[PDB]
Amino acid sequence: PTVQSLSERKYSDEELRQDISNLKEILENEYQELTSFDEYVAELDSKLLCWSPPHVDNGFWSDNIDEFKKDNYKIFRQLIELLQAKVRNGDVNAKQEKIIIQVALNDITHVVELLPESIDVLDKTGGKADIMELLNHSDSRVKYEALKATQAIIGYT
Amino acid sequence: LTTAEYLAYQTERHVLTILTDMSSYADALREVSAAREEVPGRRGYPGYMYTDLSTIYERAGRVEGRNGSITQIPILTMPNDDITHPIPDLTGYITEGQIFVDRQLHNKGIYPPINVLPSLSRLMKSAIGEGMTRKDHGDVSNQLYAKYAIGKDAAAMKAVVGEEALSIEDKLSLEFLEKFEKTFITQGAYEDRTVFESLDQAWSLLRIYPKEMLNRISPKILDEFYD
Amino acid sequence: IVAAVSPAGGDFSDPVTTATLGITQVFWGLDKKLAQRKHFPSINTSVSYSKYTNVLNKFYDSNYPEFPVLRDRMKEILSNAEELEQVVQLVGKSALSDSDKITLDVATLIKEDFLQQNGYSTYDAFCPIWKTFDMMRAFISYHDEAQKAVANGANWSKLADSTGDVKHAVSSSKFFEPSRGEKEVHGEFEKLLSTMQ
Amino acid sequence: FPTRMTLGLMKTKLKGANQGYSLLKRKSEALTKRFRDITKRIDDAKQKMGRVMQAKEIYSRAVETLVELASLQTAFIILDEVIKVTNRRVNAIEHVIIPRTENTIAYINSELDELDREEFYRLKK
């Protein structure tokens, strides 16, 4: 918080400000990994997920909670990008892809539960229709997660 | 053959036989058969050539009561890049399994181009397993072969509609194929890798794929291997 | 010993060529497809091979790379371009990726700016080893730079329309008055590669 | 006409037609799935556009999305036509080209084997 406030602060000297931003970046470098948010970032970038309690643990979710939305919820947009790409295209659920879309469903569910303002984007991202379209799936677990996210969207309307 | 036989039945020692350019020996045997002025068969080849090969490849095997074993691995170049040649057809049903060569991979500037698809061995079941090589041998072998095949199919598919239509298992098989081609397949001229190093490299290359990405692997093996 | 078989129709099933194949240490094939296409002298990509390539590389260890090890790279590019064109012929230019288009352009370039040789022309009559190695180095440079730029977030169209001189210069890189103007041409080529950005 | 080279070219063309048939089949499947999803989306867009039909400003942000959905619909129709052409090509690569190539290869093989048999008979004589 001190580094955040310092970053939000102002400085007359150039070296002071440069060292401030550098120290903030240096702190944020190892701050993201504790509780590593980069672990989920690797799964997101590679578009391949696995079994980890990243979205299961409230603490781990709370650690990356502040990093969920930076500019127009870019991280959230990239998070929904995989599911959307698995919606408009692909959408053949077997083995990996199904559990990945389900884990992404639960993660986005916890995310929406944490961030109330994350709904307005989901409507403009076409995720509102895709989430409802996921009500009927091949797996009962996938349908359960989709129904959970449906009730989550029904929580705040 | 007699030299290998003398070091087996008598000297009682492990022996290995290697023959190069069996096609040249086939043309030589053709000239030898023509020396008797006998009427040649199809495509100018002796009809007894099957027995001639049967008098060659039958010099390999294990003897009961003898510790020393003799193994033979002949080599023949297919004429005009065709497997339809009489020689290949002769050694095909006789010998168990065959090791082919891909001209594309050889023209790709890589290490030895043995196509995993065509490569097979009938006695391969007895050459692996616990006490022989490893329990992770056959399973990872079939899994790697499946990865290369499905990777090839996905390579053909991606060359059609593009890489935007790439699916999960499709992209995984693509990366696995590219990796195996640029890592697993490529060894070297003087390079010799141990079976343990081969299995380790296989598991490391298969680590790119998820745990559910391999349907050819058993639960116990996967639990006793992956770490 | 330089021997040339005369197979009828350009078939590799010729008994003369069949017998000469299991003897000669080097075989240069002539593709009937490229020959009837009024293209400069035909050489099959996958069929052409040399058993002395290892020894020739050992002798090239003194003369160094470019293009001792880059011949295998160009072979990889040409083979991959062949496997890509094999599908493309049954597919077309409609659905393809960026790397695929770059590979196709690399194929057309390797065909036109390298394999093509005019014996009738005084300038194209012959090319030096260092000259051909320089052309291959330039082609591999443009190719690697294209692959790098494709990973930099740049499209194919803008990159293709960016430099139109570099291509025409890459096609003209076959001497044409060797060997004195070699190093300077290499410097200009590197200057263009640095001018690409 | 009956040459080994011709047999090789015919066989190569046959294999290429087979691989092309498989590729066209998979492409037809993907196009079918895509056209199906686009069809469901077309129905959803039909109900959405039918929701409000028959005031103030900002109507420019309304009919635009409907125009996009209409573009998706037309693209879906074109995808259906293309899928039909692909299915026709697959049908032409099934009982037409494959059978013709197989029959031609069989006849050529018979002719070559018979010619070789005649030559071998003359040599034996």
Kindly report the number of other CB atoms within 10 A of residue C76's CB atom.
15
Q: At CA D98, angle to CA D97 and CA D101, rounded to 5? A: 80
Task: Pick C11's closest partner by Cβ from D4, D16, D23.
Answer: D4
Kindly report the number of other CB atoms within 10 A of residue A98's CB atom.
19
Diameter of chain C by CA atoms?
A: 54
Peptide-bond breaks in chain B following residues (C–N over 2.5 A): none
Count CA atoms closer than 13 A to A130's CA, side-chain side. Answer: 24
Task: Pick A96's closest partner by Cβ from B164, B165, B213.
Answer: B213
Q: Tokens for D32, please give them.
A: 């079918």
Burial of B62 per CB tally in 10 Å (0-12, 13-18, 19+): exposed
C86: left (phi over 0), alpha (psi -120 to 50) or beta: alpha
Q: Give the best residue of B77, B83, B101, B107 to mutate against chain C (max C CB count within 10 A).
A: B107
Amino acid found at C109: L
Touch test A–C: 3 Cβ pairs or more under 8 Å? no
Chain D residues within an 8 Å CB radius of A89: 34
CB D19 within 8 A of CB D63: no
Query: Alpha carbon B194 to chain centroid distance?
Result: 17
Residues linked to residue C50 through DSSP beta bridges, in sequence order: C26
Cβ within 8 Å, pair A91-D44: no
Cβ of residue B160 closer than 8 Å to a chain D Cβ? yes
For residue A88, what is the nearest residue in chain D, using CA coordinates?
Answer: D37
Cβ within 8 Å, pair D4-C9: no
Chain B residues within an 8 Å CB radius of D25: none
Cβ within 8 Å, pair B104-C73: no
Give helix A96-114 / helix B168-179 axis angle, nearest 10°.
120
3-state secondary structure of B13: coil
Cβ of residue C86 closer than 8 Å to a chain D Cβ? yes
* Cα–Cα distance for residue pair B226/B214, rounded to 1 Å: 12
Which are the contacts of D16, defined by CB distance < 8 A and separation ≥ 6? C86, C90
Chain C residues within an 8 Å CB radius of B23: 22
Q: B15-19 and C26-27: which strand pairing? A: unpaired
Which chains have 3+ CB pairs within 8 A of B?
Answer: A, C, D
* Cα–Cα distance for residue pair C74/C67, rounded to 1 Å: 9
Cβ within 8 Å, pair B160-C45: no
Cβ within 8 Å, pair C91-B159: yes
Count CA atoms closer than 13 A to B28's CA, side-chain side. Answer: 8
Place of tokens 């299915």: D87
Peptide bond preceding B55: is omega within 30 degrees of 0, i.e. cis? no
Outline where DSSP puts E strands in A4-157: none
A126 vs chain D: nearest CA distance in angstroms? 11
What are phi and psi for residue B95, nearest 5 degrees?
Answer: -70, 160
Task: Report the length, in residues, of chain B.
Answer: 227
* DSSP string across B112-134: ----TTT---SGGGTS-STTTS-
* Cα–Cα distance for residue pair C91/B158, rounded to 1 Å: 11
Tell whether the torsion through CA atoms of D101, D102, D103 and D105 is positive or negative: positive
CB D51 within 8 A of CB D110: no
**What is the enclosing helix (H) or strand (E) of D23?**
helix D4-51
Domains and CATH numbers, chain D: 4-125 (1.10.287.3240)
Cβ within 8 Å, pair B108-C100: no
* Cα–Cα distance for residue pair C176/C195, rounded to 1 Å: 24
CB B93 within 8 A of CB C59: no
CB D112 within 8 A of CB D7: yes
Residues linked to residue B16 through DSSP beta bridges, in sequence order: B71
User: What is the end-to-end Cα distance of chain D in Å, rounded?
Assistant: 27
CB B154 within 8 A of CB B177: yes
Give resolution, Å, one decimal. Answer: 7.0
For residue D18, what is the nearest residue in chain C, using CA coordinates?
Answer: C90
Burial of D24 per CB tally in 10 Å (0-12, 13-18, 19+): buried
Amino acid found at B18: I
Amino acid found at C62: S
* DSSP string across chain C: -------GGG-TT-HHHHHHHTT-SEE----HHHHTTT-SS---TTT-EETTHHHHHHHHHHH-SSSTTHHHHHHHHHHHHHHHHHHHTTT-SSS--HHHHHHHHHHHHHIIIII---SSSSSSS---HHHHHHHHHHHHHHHHHHHHHHTTT--HHHHHHH-SHHHHHHHT-S-SSTTTTHHHHHHHHHHHHHHH-
Q: B15-19 and B70-74: which strand pairing? A: parallel
D91 vs chain C: nearest CA distance in angstroms? 16
Of A126, B74, C52, A73, the C-alpha closest to D65 is A126
* Cα–Cα distance for residue pair B31/B29, rounded to 1 Å: 5
Q: Give the best residue of B164, B166, B167, B208 to mutate against chain A (max A CB count within 10 A).
A: B167
D65 vs chain B: nearest CA distance in angstroms? 24
* Cα–Cα distance for residue pair D12/A79, rounded to 1 Å: 47
* DSSP string across A26-48: HHHHHHSTTTTSHHHHHHHHTT-
Q: B70-74 and C49-50: which strand pairing? A: unpaired
* Cα–Cα distance for residue pair A57/C108, rounded to 1 Å: 56
* Cα–Cα distance for residue pair C189/C191, rounded to 1 Å: 5
Cβ of residue A87 closer than 8 Å to a chain B Cβ? no
* Cα–Cα distance for residue pair B112/B108, rounded to 1 Å: 10
Burial of C5 per CB tally in 10 Å (0-12, 13-18, 19+): middle
**What is the enclosing helix (H) or strand (E) of B25?**
helix B22-34
* Cα–Cα distance for residue pair C173/C180, rounded to 1 Å: 14
* Cα–Cα distance for residue pair B167/B213, rounded to 1 Å: 13
3-state secondary structure of B61: strand
3-state secondary structure of B43: coil
Chain C residues within an 8 Å CB radius of B164: 97
DSSP state of A11: -
What are the CA-CA distances from residue C140 to residues A126, B154, C67, C74, C82 (Å)?
A: 44, 27, 10, 7, 17
* DSSP string across B166-182: --HHHHHHHHHHHHIII
D63 vs chain A: nearest CA distance in angstroms? 16
Cβ within 8 Å, pair B103-C73: no
Which are the contacts of D63, defined by CB distance < 8 A and separation ≥ 6? none
What are phi and psi for residue B78, nearest 5 degrees?
Answer: -70, 125
* Cα–Cα distance for residue pair C123/C120, rounded to 1 Å: 9
Query: Alpha carbon C166 to chain centroid distance?
Result: 17
For residue B76, what is the nearest residue in chain C, using CA coordinates?
Answer: C22
User: What is the end-to-end Cα distance of chain C in Å, rounded?
Assistant: 49
User: For the CA atoms of chain C, what is the radius of gyration?
Assistant: 18
* Cα–Cα distance for residue pair B10/D106, rounded to 1 Å: 53
**What is the enclosing helix (H) or strand (E) of B15?**
strand B15-19
Cβ of residue B80 closer than 8 Å to a chain D Cβ? no
B21 vs chain D: nearest CA distance in angstroms? 25
Cβ of residue B113 closer than 8 Å to a chain C Cβ? no
By what technique were these coordinates determined? X-ray
Residues linked to residue C27 through DSSP beta bridges, in sequence order: C49
Task: Pick B161's closest partner by Cβ from D27, D116, D123.
Answer: D27
* Cα–Cα distance for residue pair B192/B189, rounded to 1 Å: 8
What are phi and psi for residue B57, nearest 5 degrees?
Answer: -65, -10
B188: left (phi over 0), alpha (psi -120 to 50) or beta: left
Residues linked to residue B70 through DSSP beta bridges, in sequence order: B15, B61
Q: Tokens for A155, please give them.
A: 């929580």
CB B174 within 8 A of CB B151: yes
Binding site residue list of B for ATP:
122
CA dihedral B149, B186, B133, B190 (to 10 degrees): 150
Q: Tokens for D101, please give them.
A: 């190539």
* Cα–Cα distance for residue pair C119/C40, rounded to 1 Å: 9
Task: Report the length, in residues, of chain D.
Answer: 125
Residues linked to residue B71 through DSSP beta bridges, in sequence order: B16
What are phi and psi for residue B17, nearest 5 degrees?
Answer: -110, 140
Of B133, B21, B131, B30, the C-alpha closest to B78 is B21
Amino acid found at A113: E
Which are the contacts of C176, defined by CB distance < 8 A and separation ≥ 6? C123, C124
Cβ within 8 Å, pair A50-B211: yes
Of C21, C5, C12, C49, the C-alpha closest to B21 is C21
Query: Alpha carbon C44 to chain centroid distance?
Result: 12
Q: At CA C90, angle to CA C86 and CA C94, rounded to 5? A: 105
